[PDB]
Design an enzyme around this catalytic site. Structure first.
Site, PDB file in Angstrom:
ATOM      1  N   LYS A 261       0.828  -1.200   0.000  1.00  0.00           N
ATOM      2  CA  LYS A 261       0.000   0.000   0.000  1.00  0.00           C
ATOM      3  C   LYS A 261       0.866   1.256   0.000  1.00  0.00           C
ATOM      4  O   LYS A 261       0.563   2.242  -0.690  1.00  0.00           O
ATOM      5  CB  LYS A 261      -0.958  -0.017   1.197  1.00  0.00           C
ATOM      6  CG  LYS A 261      -1.981   1.113   1.183  1.00  0.00           C
ATOM      7  CD  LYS A 261      -2.931   1.058   2.379  1.00  0.00           C
ATOM      8  CE  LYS A 261      -3.883   2.249   2.423  1.00  0.00           C
ATOM      9  NZ  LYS A 261      -4.752   2.285   3.647  1.00  0.00           N
TER      10      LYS A 261
ATOM     11  N   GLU B 225      10.546  -4.782   4.140  1.00  0.00           N
ATOM     12  CA  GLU B 225      10.717  -6.155   3.682  1.00  0.00           C
ATOM     13  C   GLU B 225      10.324  -6.304   2.216  1.00  0.00           C
ATOM     14  O   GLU B 225      11.052  -6.928   1.430  1.00  0.00           O
ATOM     15  CB  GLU B 225       9.908  -7.095   4.572  1.00  0.00           C
ATOM     16  CG  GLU B 225      10.327  -7.005   6.031  1.00  0.00           C
ATOM     17  CD  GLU B 225       9.326  -6.237   6.888  1.00  0.00           C
ATOM     18  OE1 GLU B 225       9.108  -5.026   6.631  1.00  0.00           O
ATOM     19  OE2 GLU B 225       8.748  -6.859   7.817  1.00  0.00           O
TER      20      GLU B 225
HETATM   21  O1  LIG Z   1       0.509  -3.073   2.469  1.00  0.00           O
HETATM   22  P1  LIG Z   1       1.911  -2.620   2.770  1.00  0.00           P
HETATM   23  O2  LIG Z   1       2.174  -1.173   2.499  1.00  0.00           O
HETATM   24  O3  LIG Z   1       2.986  -3.565   2.323  1.00  0.00           O
HETATM   25  O4  LIG Z   1       1.990  -2.647   4.358  1.00  0.00           O
HETATM   26  C1  LIG Z   1       2.273  -3.845   5.050  1.00  0.00           C
HETATM   27  C2  LIG Z   1       1.322  -3.798   6.214  1.00  0.00           C
HETATM   28  O5  LIG Z   1       0.802  -5.077   6.501  1.00  0.00           O
HETATM   29  C3  LIG Z   1      -0.509  -4.837   6.973  1.00  0.00           C
HETATM   30  O6  LIG Z   1      -1.294  -4.420   5.857  1.00  0.00           O
HETATM   31  C4  LIG Z   1      -0.528  -3.748   8.050  1.00  0.00           C
HETATM   32  O7  LIG Z   1      -1.315  -2.623   7.623  1.00  0.00           O
HETATM   33  C5  LIG Z   1       0.847  -3.311   8.574  1.00  0.00           C
HETATM   34  O8  LIG Z   1       1.275  -4.239   9.573  1.00  0.00           O
HETATM   35  C6  LIG Z   1       1.914  -3.247   7.498  1.00  0.00           C
HETATM   36  O9  LIG Z   1       2.319  -1.889   7.329  1.00  0.00           O
END
Ligand SMILES: O=P(O)(O)OC[C@H]1O[C@H](O)[C@H](O)[C@@H](O)[C@@H]1O
Ligand SMILES: O=P(O)(O)OC[C@H]1O[C@H](O)[C@H](O)[C@@H](O)[C@@H]1O
Lengths: 562, 562
Positions: free
Chosen positions: B209, B215
């Site tokens: 997102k 990671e």
């Molecule tokens: O969707 P991303 O931007 O990769 O974010 C990864 C995300 O995992 C989940 O969606 C949670 O919202 C958070 O624990 C983390 O930030």
């Protein structure tokens, strides 16, 4: 005799809880001497538990509980092959599966080691005959694909070790071009899965059941056996299926040659059976008996450590006592297994069985109804995955004590030129941070110091003082995998010993089997005989009526495979 | 105010004492009760008669839902209000599966046209992609897709994908194709994801997102290097595409701007599988129509959830029963127990969907909560979990269970002469286990079966342990979408009753901060020889033990796995 919760020691720990409640880990984690005390170490295994809600006094008080509960004697009695599984009247000797060829461990008056090694060598010979292509199919091809059919402790333990060895360079090499799949579920979808992209002519089938009567495994066993006959003929069965079980009379009657049967014993708990032929046979076909024997020696190394090391240095003892501390005195009902390795992905599911089937018990070993709850709810996922799943609750919702497992040497190291840190170093930076994040929290003053808007400080506070412990392992090869396994097998037994329950029985599964056979009989009578739904409560009767309202598509009594 | 102070809450609290004077083995004989504690919508039937409750209990939950203004909060969600007050965002995962004519407003702007704009873009690409027209650098068509992402960018898609893998429609549209998920930063997970892959025939999709998650980006740059190292630095615009909310950062990564697929700030990560996060990789594996049937499944529940009265409202009933079990019956955990191997990855997604939404310590107004809220979730599929932890669920801690079963098998199998079909063998466990947890088995029955008096206590089942059951007509894409939508809305209901923000996730930040500090230390020590400094004594030692081992590769030199 006396319930452990009646002893002065038990109550002495309950008074101690109020003292720990006055302390915070943000302060405790500055004490060099406290934190150096709350470690232990054996070969490649380092254990740091300074992030428990505990002082050295807590640990001292926990030790006198262990004496009052006769923990040392209970451990030797296990190792001596005494029938401590009293409700089934069985010895408890998974340790004898990895004991050295010279050891003397008696059950029922006989030394069980020579027969333990009898199977190992038979597996070794078969493994070499198998892997070298001299064990051939019906169309003459050599077998390269193995389906292990089994459930429960016939499945989760082996799956765990196979997933841990998959990406270790040495083992991965030995398993080149070979597959090891697990058929566990009775759901016919699982059956489709395990045979997809497979060749009956090149596939070996191993049937694993301590009983050879388990309903899901034997139907899988009969289903995959027909897949073989559909494609290779009624005689292919002998060259394409083998079995691991306690009861070889039942293996003969299933149609498997009695010399293709590899035995284990009733003093091998299911959830403690991976070191027996249950895991050694299939792992030896994939990785060769040299790799598997290393896994055993690892497990054997902790067996000696657990049996002989003092309690301040004893990793299984420390783990189990701190788990009782968290469960029975701080009141934490769940526990998270959080290993920073995708290789340990299947570790939490196996610990789930090992832990909850052993200690999900309501009565003492003598049949006294427990006035306290025993047996934590175990879950987890590997880091960093779990970090982005549920750590939100671990930091700001219900308190859940954690097991962090990190490995120093990576199995599959990666670095890109110009990167700040290697991939494995990126992974480990969370491994070192998360337990400190859990210990210290972040105060609202600390937030207002950083000009966080007042309306948000409530939402950004971390209370901290949430407990954790950290394993740091030298590497993750067969030897160390076996050490990890032994450490949890022994930790669970220690919690059971302290709790004074039978870690080694499983009566809680009998009622679901009974009612399922009652439903199975209802399903036959309706599908095959058109008989109504009768004898169930109004909810069950409606649900069954919904299910059976959808009549099969297949001509009556006609075989269909995926 | 605070929900725990209201009369509706205190009434429900005393009501627990009346429920404790009942026992399900009686309650289940009442045909009036059993019939009333159900709900149904299309091929989705909910039986919750095995809950520790009566229609009066449900009556009282409804008056809590009223005091909580549950109806209101659902309407504000659906209308597009920014109910996510701590981040000032709308909550409109409903809009991802809305139809084109729909009018859903965020900041006076209707968001639906943009939703379908990405959707239409995905479909066009997925035809291009699957036709073979879209080729790689060597000109070969792309067979295999790897999806790089974590948490919300990962778990939902993995679940939906595991479910569709065996569906006979989807499987047919997916033949010859792979869709793999690279999620952990652990380089083992990179080695696994590219195992047996050829970058010439591989397409990579980067999902995040923020497009800044540490990671995911390292894995992204890592898999980029895999592609350039084999096919040249031009091969990137051909083999890599991206999904995110920030396209500027997507351009910066180096991906063709029209190979970016948007979604928006009002899509939670754990509520994002119906956006391009899921729709894009799934459309590549399964075709866009299959994915459109999934979205339609989700949409039907949205309408059902938004319009149906509370006593027929499946997500409202589910969320209130779960609150009942959590806050009044005291149960800290919840078990997701699908009796389907295809739903094997359901529980890991629900872990994130529930525990990240509801593992909160303060109300949506920043008031500290005087009770605990979000429950610990976990599961394994049946019958697997049956032979793992059910021992504890029957005889240890009480754990409310969600049982999910499917009428029609995705993969039906029958052997001539078998007493039941394999799917029927599976389902007789699905029908038996709830009854067995409701009824128990008294010492009186056991003595009446001539169980020795010393074994009676160990074989006793107390019963009156709660469960609910879903019966699905089938498990095609449409029903997977409904199941997804049911749970997304159940979790919201729970947060709304509790009065918390189910949609922020501040609890993840502190681990991120301290992990940066660790990453800095590792670079300073790996690349600059700097000592370890600024950590507590426990962490100092752990870091030194880890840095002790130097990497075997030359300075700043790129290494890939296997
Ligand atoms: O969707 P991303 O931007 O990769 O974010 C990864 C995300 O995992 C989940 O969606 C949670 O919202 C958070 O624990 C983390 O930030
Ligand atoms: O090994 P089997 O005879 O096939 O039995 C399978 C068993 O796996 C484990 O041992 C579990 O404790 C049992 O719930 C299950 O029955």
């Amino acid at each position: 005799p006396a319930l452990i919760s009646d002893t002065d020691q038990w109550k002495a720990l309950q008074a101690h809880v109020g003292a720990i409640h006055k302390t915070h880990l943000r302060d405790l984690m500055t004490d060099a001497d406290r934190c150096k005390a709350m470690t232990a170490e054996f070969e490649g295994v380092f254990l740091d538990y300074s992030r428990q809600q505990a002082t050295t006094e807590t640990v001292d008080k926990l030790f006198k509980l262990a004496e009052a509960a006769k923990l040392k004697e209970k451990i030797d009695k296990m190792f001596k092959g005494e029938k401590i599984n009293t409700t089934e009247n069985r010895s408890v000797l998974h340790v004898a599966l990895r004991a050295p060829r010279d050891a003397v461990i008696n059950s029922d008056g006989v030394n069980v080691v020579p027969e333990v090694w009898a199977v190992k060598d038979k597996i070794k010979q078969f493994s070499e005959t198998f892997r070298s292509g001299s064990w051939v199919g019906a169309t003459g091809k050599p077998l390269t694909n193995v389906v292990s059919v089994g459930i429960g402790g016939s499945f989760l333990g082996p799956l765990f070790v196979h997933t841990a060895l998959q990406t270790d360079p040495e083992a991965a090499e030995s398993a080149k071009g070979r597959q090891l799949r697990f058929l566990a579920n009775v759901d016919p979808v699982d059956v489709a899965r395990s045979i997809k992209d497979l060749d009956p002519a090149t596939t070996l089938v191993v049937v694993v059941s301590k009983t050879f009567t388990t309903a899901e495994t034997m139907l899988n066993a009969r289903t995959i056996k027909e897949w073989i006959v559909s494609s290779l003929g009624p005689q292919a069965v002998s060259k394409h299926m083998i079995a691991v079980s306690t009861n070889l009379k039942l293996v003969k009657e299933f149609g498997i040659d009695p010399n293709n049967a590899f035995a284990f014993w009733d003093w091998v708990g299911g959830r403690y059976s991976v070191c027996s032929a249950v895991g050694v046979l299939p792992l030896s076909l994939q990785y060769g008996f040299p790799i598997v024997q290393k896994f055993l020696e690892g497990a054997s190394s902790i067996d000696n450590h657990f049996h002989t090391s003092s309690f301040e240095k004893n990793i299984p003892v420390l783990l189990g006592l701190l788990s009782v501390w968290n469960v029975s005195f701080l009141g934490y009902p769940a526990r998270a297994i959080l290993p920073y390795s995708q290789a340990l992905e299947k570790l939490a599911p196996h610990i789930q069985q090992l832990s909850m089937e052993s200690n999900g018990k309501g009565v003492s070993i003598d049949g006294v109804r427990l006035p306290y709850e025993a047996g934590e709810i175990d879950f987890g996922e590997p880091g960093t995955n779990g970090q982005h799943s549920f750590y939100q609750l671990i930091h700001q919702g219900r308190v859940i004590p954690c097991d962090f497992i990190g490995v120093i040497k990576s199995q599959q190291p990666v670095y890109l030129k110009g990167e700040t840190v290697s991939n494995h170093d990126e992974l480990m930076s969370n491994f070192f941070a998360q337990p400190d994040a859990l210990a210290y929290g972040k105060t609202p003053e600390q937030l207002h110091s950083e000009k966080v808007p007042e309306n948000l400080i409530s939402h950004k506070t971390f209370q901290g003082n949430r407990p954790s412990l950290s394993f740091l392992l030298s590497s993750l090869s067969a030897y160390e995998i076996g050490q990890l396994l032994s450490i949890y097998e022994h930790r669970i037994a220690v919690q059971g010993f302290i709790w004074g329950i039978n870690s080694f029985d499983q009566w809680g599964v009998e009622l679901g089997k009974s009612l399922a056979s009652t439903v199975r009989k209802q399903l036959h009578a309706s599908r095959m005989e058109g008989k109504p739904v009768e004898g169930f409560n109004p909810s069950s009767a409606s649900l069954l009526t919904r299910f059976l309202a959808v009549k099969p598509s297949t001509p009556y009594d006609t075989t269909v495979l995926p």
